Amino acid sequence: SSTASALGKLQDVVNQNAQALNTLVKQLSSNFGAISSVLNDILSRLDPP
Amino acid sequence: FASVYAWNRKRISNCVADYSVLYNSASFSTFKCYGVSPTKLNDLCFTNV
Numbered sequence: 302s303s304t305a306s307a308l309g310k311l312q313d314v315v316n317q318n319a320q321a322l323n324t325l326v327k328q329l330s331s332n333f334g335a336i337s338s339v340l341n342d343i344l345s346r347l348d349p350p
Numbered sequence: 351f352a353s354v355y356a357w358n359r360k361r362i363s364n365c366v367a368d369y370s371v372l373y374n375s376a377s378f379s380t381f382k383c384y385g386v387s388p389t390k391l392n393d394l395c396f397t398n399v
């Protein structure tokens with residue numbers, strides 16, 4: 302009841318899963334060498350070829 | 351118009367431009383553009399030119 306920080310393993314597992322998911326969803330915002338990171342702009346601005 | 355070493359730079363803003371009536375003009379020797387498809391110049395909207 303009083304002393305905390307005795308449940309490290311479960312918290313570590315949850316943290317690892319959440320952090321992996323967050324970094325995966327954050328990866329979507331990169332440019333990857335193109336001129337825009339949003340696909341709608343690149344489809345609506347430039348010639349399909 | 352001025353010379354190449356003293357090219358005339360001007361700002362165009364706060365107006366409803368019309369490139370369709372200008373693109374169809376046949377008096378131009380060449381008309382080559384980078385980064386945008388000309389047919390999609392009638393729906394894009396910029397801040398200043």
Ligand SMILES: *[C@@H]1O[C@H](CO)[C@@H](O[C@@H]2O[C@H](CO)[C@@H](O)[C@H](O)[C@H]2NC(C)=O)[C@H](O)[C@H]1NC(C)=O
Pocket residue numbers: 374375376377378
């Ligand atoms: C200067 O103005 C004239 C006339 O306003 C333009 O001439 C037009 O040229 C196009 C293509 O050659 C024609 O389709 C139009 O019919 C012409 N206009 C008229 C009223 O007949 C000329 O293109 C303009 N030049 C510049 C550099 O803007």
